[PDB]
Amino acid sequence: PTVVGRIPVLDVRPVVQRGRRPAKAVTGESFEVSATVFREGHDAVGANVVLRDPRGRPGPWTPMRELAPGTDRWGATVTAGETGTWSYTVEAWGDPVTTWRHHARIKIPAGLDTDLVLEEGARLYERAAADVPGREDRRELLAAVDALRDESRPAASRLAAALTPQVDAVLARHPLRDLVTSSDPLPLLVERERALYGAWYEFFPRSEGTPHTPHGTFRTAARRLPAIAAMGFDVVYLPPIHPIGTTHRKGRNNTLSATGDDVGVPWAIGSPEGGHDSIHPALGTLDDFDHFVTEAGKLGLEIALDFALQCSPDHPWVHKHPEWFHHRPDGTIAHAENPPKKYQDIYPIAFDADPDGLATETVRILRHWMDHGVRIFRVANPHTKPVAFWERVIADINGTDPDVIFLAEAFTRPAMMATLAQIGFQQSYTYFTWRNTKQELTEYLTELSGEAASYMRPNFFANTPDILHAYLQHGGRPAFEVRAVLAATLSPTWGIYSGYELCENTPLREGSEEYLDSEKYQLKPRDWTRAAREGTTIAPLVTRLNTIRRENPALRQLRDLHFHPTDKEEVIAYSKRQGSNTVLVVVNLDPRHTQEATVSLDMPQLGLDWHESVPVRDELTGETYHWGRANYVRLEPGRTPAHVCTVL
Amino acid sequence: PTVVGRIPVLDVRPVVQRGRRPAKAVTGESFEVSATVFREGHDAVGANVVLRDPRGRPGPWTPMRELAPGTDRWGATVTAGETGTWSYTVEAWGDPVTTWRHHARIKIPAGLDTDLVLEEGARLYERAAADVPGREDRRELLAAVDALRDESRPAASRLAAALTPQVDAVLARHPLRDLVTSSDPLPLLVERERALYGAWYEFFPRSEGTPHTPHGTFRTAARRLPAIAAMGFDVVYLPPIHPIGTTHRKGRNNTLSATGDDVGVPWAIGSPEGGHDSIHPALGTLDDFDHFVTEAGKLGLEIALDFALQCSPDHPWVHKHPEWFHHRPDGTIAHAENPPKKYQDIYPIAFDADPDGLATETVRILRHWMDHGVRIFRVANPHTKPVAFWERVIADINGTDPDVIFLAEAFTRPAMMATLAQIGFQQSYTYFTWRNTKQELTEYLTELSGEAASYMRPNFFANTPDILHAYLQHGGRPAFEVRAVLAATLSPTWGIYSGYELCENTPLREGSEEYLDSEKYQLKPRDWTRAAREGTTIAPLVTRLNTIRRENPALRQLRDLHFHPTDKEEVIAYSKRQGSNTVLVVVNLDPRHTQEATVSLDMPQLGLDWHESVPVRDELTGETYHWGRANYVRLEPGRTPAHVCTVL
Ligand SMILES: OC[C@H]1O[C@H](O[C@H]2[C@H](O)[C@@H](O)[C@@H](O[C@H]3[C@H](O)[C@@H](O)[C@@H](O[C@H]4[C@H](O)[C@@H](O)[C@@H](O)O[C@@H]4CO)O[C@@H]3CO[C@H]3O[C@H](CO)[C@@H](O[C@H]4O[C@H](CO)[C@@H](O[C@H]5O[C@H](CO)[C@@H](O[C@H]6O[C@H](CO)[C@@H](O[C@H]7O[C@H](CO)[C@@H](O)[C@H](O)[C@H]7O)[C@H](O)[C@H]6O)[C@H](O)[C@H]5O)[C@H](O)[C@H]4O)[C@H](O)[C@H]3O)O[C@@H]2CO)[C@H](O)[C@@H](O)[C@@H]1O
Ligand SMILES: OC[C@H]1O[C@H](O[C@H]2[C@H](O)[C@@H](O)[C@@H](O[C@H]3[C@H](O)[C@@H](O)[C@@H](O[C@H]4[C@H](O)[C@@H](O)[C@@H](O[C@H]5[C@H](O)[C@@H](O)[C@@H](OC[C@H]6O[C@H](O)[C@H](O)[C@@H](O)[C@@H]6O)O[C@@H]5CO)O[C@@H]4CO)O[C@@H]3CO)O[C@@H]2CO)[C@H](O)[C@@H](O)[C@@H]1O
Ligand SMILES: OC[C@H]1O[C@H](O[C@H]2[C@H](O)[C@@H](O)[C@@H](O[C@H]3[C@H](O)[C@@H](O)[C@@H](O[C@H]4[C@H](O)[C@@H](O)[C@@H](O[C@H]5[C@H](O)[C@@H](O)[C@@H](O)O[C@@H]5CO)O[C@@H]4CO)O[C@@H]3CO)O[C@@H]2CO)[C@H](O)[C@@H](O)[C@@H]1O
Ligand SMILES: OC[C@H]1O[C@H](O[C@H]2[C@H](O)[C@@H](O)[C@@H](O[C@H]3[C@H](O)[C@@H](O)[C@@H](O[C@H]4[C@H](O)[C@@H](O)[C@@H](O[C@H]5[C@H](O)[C@@H](O)[C@@H](O)O[C@@H]5CO)O[C@@H]4CO)O[C@@H]3CO)O[C@@H]2CO)[C@H](O)[C@@H](O)[C@@H]1O
Ligand SMILES: OC[C@H]1O[C@H](O[C@H]2[C@H](O)[C@@H](O)[C@H](O)O[C@@H]2CO)[C@H](O)[C@@H](O)[C@@H]1O
Ligand SMILES: OC[C@H]1O[C@H](O[C@H]2[C@H](O)[C@@H](O)[C@H](O)O[C@@H]2CO)[C@H](O)[C@@H](O)[C@@H]1O
């Protein structure tokens, strides 16, 4: 057998690791399938995409078109349906009718061999009619056949009967396909909506306590959930909820010795009170956890738990499974590091003595939390554990529970970040916090919305407990507003860490991205009621952004994104589309100074002609404008961080 | 099982059609194997390439290096040996010694756990010594172990004993490799030197006749071979040598009706005198063909025959195999076309009624000519026959006779041209004749010498009987000189069609690339002796170019090519290297005006420091210059078309 088939169909995309891992989508998401399709000689080709669902049933007729003339690159948009493992194939074929029509349109007016030409047409159309399933379509084609063969009609009339719009519509749906050749099937993994789209809020339950009991419980933290749901969040991400070690517990501001009252770091998991399958006693019991999960569910909030495969020196694993750790020649275990960061309060796990034991235990733990309603896991530092370990763990969990979503917190080099997404992580943290200039945002979002979208789903956290960017430090509230608009409108998934709304921006020291008095090392009570009363919170903006996202399908997808030129370096403009919904955003990246700019819209990318003027509504203010190809904007920090406009 | 192994090794290149077809090389040719290699955590990785020969035997130790810092892209140069089907694998591994050294160089001066660190080193070096085959290398490592453990030496001295150049040399050859993980093997097809490197000369034997018999024979045409060999050619390409049809024979200058004396076109193959396995009676017999092949061989010339799968209406196939043709409804067969070109003198072949019969007959024909010493075929218009047909034919022929070279004359779109090379064509015609400006040449050669070199070998014909470019038409002799220098120095395979040496450049009409009074349609006697005597031939330049190529290995490869900036649009500069051989070419593309320029050499690409000044010899003149990073050149049409320099 030959590698190339009768009609060449080559380099089908998307493809991930040469077909060894699936391309990704979620239910209702569109993307392009493409291929290089051509044939020998000068006659025309056609192509179509066959999508097969998890039961092997083919999807609808999906013809492709040549994407640019003379390139031989063909494409079609497909839309993912129900969740599961699908496949896609490109079918390529000679299109003899298109070729015959091209020649007949020339030869018939010229009087060149008109009887042969028309009989040749008649034979193609009768072959077309024989493959057509519907009676009325067949009759339409056969009437064209009879007209083509009718020697009593003028040549031009015989030809015209074969080129009618009604004949065209039949042949667009059921073309005559010669020498049909298929690509080898490629896999598509279709996952639930939340894998791509959702707003996330991170907070520490222990910080939501009372004057009588400063250490919050699941019951006290549950009373924070209504405010989180009212800001329009969908997912609450909790730091580790397990007992915390005492040996080498860290003190406040990342100091090495805890005092007697110090709470330690939740990531220093494990004590004689229990490990990763247990609840910190000060948070309450598993029954209290269940209450928290249930109250979250009532308010439209899913819980994401941190899963950090590491432990404190007091974790039961340390003496039960010594082979899960690297021991130095004196028998001791070195503390974990992620240079220049040091984690003196924990041991890292070693994987090569007992990989099977570790995987078995990992999936036991995850299934325990899954049985208590946790269907999302934020996986801590996955890039410091083996790639194939995650591949195995995720395949095991998703094999019985395909709805479970894993988020990779891998702030590392591009090859590792991409590979983790490709081996099964549904979502990835990103470089978003370090992309702040127009050039940085433009380049990075062009990457994320391009080929990477076949395997990676970005979660844009504007801050985390480990990342307070200088932009926020120096820009104050106007900068928090800008980064919220950007995160919420550039990615279908975004998030914030509690305190972002209050514009907390005091760093540990100059040149650090750590918070002063970080919540990782201490209880951090916040007077939410006071901040709301005093108007010192951007919760209203956050709430509005989430409402805009919920009302505009364009903001609930990733791949359709276009940057429009402006004449100011500090002003960025972009549009997103989904069906008839178009959102147009203009952001002033300068948190200190008012910017005036001309935004020049690429009108064809909005589906409009260059001369058109179309109404927009800025959803942040309710103000309506009329914008054409060139529009003045004025954006003032503290009043108008951005325009977030719908086309009406 | 998991897709990713213990140490990730991904996206191995080169790759062709995702590993379904081989990457290519020839004996003695170097190229780069690369991969993306990294691991979890912060410890170091290593990698190496394992090349396996046709008997499965591994090549030498071939360590890779990271190609640019922080990219995780690793590479090594490999060199192809004997012809056949090879494979290559990338092996990736943890490099614990490099990691330990990095930590020890920090921790030992700091006084941080120095006894543990040194003992840990001792145990690694012991493990390294256990895998080392040479006794002297083992003793070197074990002496380092004993020094590491020697508590009577200062800490810094214990460490330094493990970092000596002699220890380094052992570990460069036999590193301690943890967790060795392999890519899946990729195929490499290694072919003979001539597939990549050779100078080609096309001529029509029938034009080399005598006053007594104007239609040349193989015996008269053989007397042209000494001049061809003396110009330094390696391959003589003959147009079709078979009987020529009478029905619809073309007249002179592509007219539709032949007169009584008209010879017709050699591509109109076949008559009752025979088909593709026969000799035109006016050329003589098969015994005369054998004489011509034998005389060619004595002069170091291989014959390439045209193979054109098509025929005249008088070919025996027409009535013997009607199913090898497309018949219209009245039973007639339409003449072949390649729009806007019409081939009224031939029928094209149809492939879908009897593909097996056609393949069987095609390989019969090729094997016939192979039995008469023809080991190279110039395949006419392969892109008008099915791609999979050629894939099958070439695999059949190369299965018994892997030395046979097929050249694809496919002037068509890029997808088809690439695919034909990928399915088995050893060489390809190219866009060379339509790349004449500095920008065109630079861009096109960057493509050919880059990734395309894994599957395509270009044959740069400066002219053909179908292509007299306007550049040559308007530029005259100075333009013929420029295009010869370019073709001969940019590709390891180049060629000319007879008459190029005489600067024949009269077109059929303005705006055509056809020759006036084309040799395709008429006998074309040339007075070779006169042109040489009158100095109106560029044969001496052609001869010199071929001698330079034969003396400079840099010109017998494709992939190593670098363009150097000049400050004039009409002056192009490039270098090629192979081992210690470096050739530096500067060409004036203006055939009308003298150009003065500053050529600014990228000195690192010549393997030199920026401040160096190195002697060169212009091999066209024998003149010696001293060139550094910025050099004045003056190039005058009719005197100095170019400098073709060797570094001394
Ligand atoms: O002469 C009348 C005109 O003179 C005046 O203007 C010219 C300047 O004097 C001259 O310097 C040059 O200007 C440069 C300028 O210096 C440079 O900074 C730059 O400027 C540009 C800016 O960088 C840019 O930012 C922007 O602003 O634009 C600026 C303008 O372009 O580039 C200018 C242009 O240079 C380029 O074009 C010119 C013109 O086409 C071209 O030739 C002229 O300059 C060269 C070098 O300066 C002169 O050559 C002299 O030096 C060489 C080197 O020694 C002498 O050559 C002798 O030795 C060599 C051996 O090395 C020998 O050659 C043999 O070997 C070589 C291989 O090595 C073979 O290739 C040869 O075949 C072989 O023979 C040679 O035989 C021997 O003679 C030479 O004799 C000296 O004369 C030329 O004479 C100039 O014509 C230049 O190379 C190119 O780089 O150009 C100005 C003209 O535009 C007046 O202002 C003007 O009005 C007068 O009409
Ligand atoms: O569309 C949404 C928009 O709606 C509301 O805006 C109102 C606005 O309140 C109202 O006043 C009016 O806008 C007028 C404006 O009043 C008027 O002054 C004039 O604006 C010019 C402006 O005063 C002047 O400083 C300058 O501004 C900048 C340019 O816009 C910008 O393109 C840039 O140009 C720099 C140079 O670049 C090259 O070198 C070039 O060769 C050279 O020619 C350029 O000068 O920088 C300028 C200064 O830094 O030019 C302005 C002209 O456009 O005209 C405005 C247009 O009507 O109406 C709008 C409603 O459309 C709402 O208040 C606002 O917040 C919201 O954004
Ligand atoms: O006798 C036939 C023909 O021979 C000679 O043509 C040769 C060209 O001179 C030479 O460059 C090469 O052409 C290739 C080309 O290099 C390659 O890129 C591809 O061209 C594609 C374009 O890539 C594609 O964009 C599209 O071009 C558009 C263009 O973008 C648009 O702006 C506008 O100008 O219309 C164009 C046409 O749709 O399509 C072309 C393909 O149609 O393929 C080319 C080969 O087809 O090789 C040619 C010979 O094969 C003579 O120069 C020419 O006069 C003769 O007609
Ligand atoms: O907590 C650690 C770290 O966090 C923050 O860094 C983040 C960066 O701000 C952010 O941009 C991102 O960095 C990525 C980077 O985007 C990505 O391209 C890759 O970087 C490679 C380069 O591609 C590669 O060329 C090479 O860089 C060379 C450079 O070309 C050369 O000119 C010269 O400057 O040396 C450089 C270093 O060799 O290597 C780097 C890899 O080191 O990967 C980066 C990630 O490693 O994400 C960072 C967090 O993951 C803080 O900003 C930083 O201060 C903290 O130390
Ligand atoms: O208790 C261990 C360390 O916890 C934190 O570091 C976390 C980080 O907050 C989290 O985002 C990431 O996923 O994991 C690391 C490692 O656990 C503190 O920042 C450290 O100071 C603690 O040592
Ligand atoms: O006799 C058929 C045609 O032959 C020539 O065309 C050749 C061309 O010269 C050759 O390089 C290519 O490989 O094949 C074509 C087609 O045979 C003449 O140029 C045509 O006029 C003839 O009709």
Author numbering:
A (entry chain B), B (entry chain A): 15 to 662
The authors write:
GlgE is an α-maltose 1-phosphate:(1→4)-α-d-glucan 4-α-d-maltosyltransferase (starch synthase (maltosyl-transferring), EC 2.4.99.16) and a member of the carbohydrate-active enzymes database (CAZy) GH13_3 family. It is the third and defining enzyme of the four-step GlgE pathway that is responsible for the biosynthesis of a branched α-glucan. The key contribution that GlgE makes is to preferentially extend A chains, limiting the opportunity for GlgB to introduce a second branch into B and C chains. The enzyme consists of five domains, four of which are typical of the α-amylase family.
This GlgE variant was co-crystallized with a preparation of maltodextrin, which contains a wide range of both linear and α-1,6 branched oligosaccharides according to mass spectrometry and NMR spectroscopy. However, a linear malto-oligosaccharide was observed bound to the cyclodextrin binding site for the first time. Similarly, another oligosaccharide was observed in the structure of the D394A GlgE variant obtained with maltodextrin. Remarkably, several additional glucose residues were resolvable within the electron density. There was an α-1,6 linkage between the reducing end of the proximal pentasaccharide and the second residue from the reducing end of the distal tetra-saccharide.
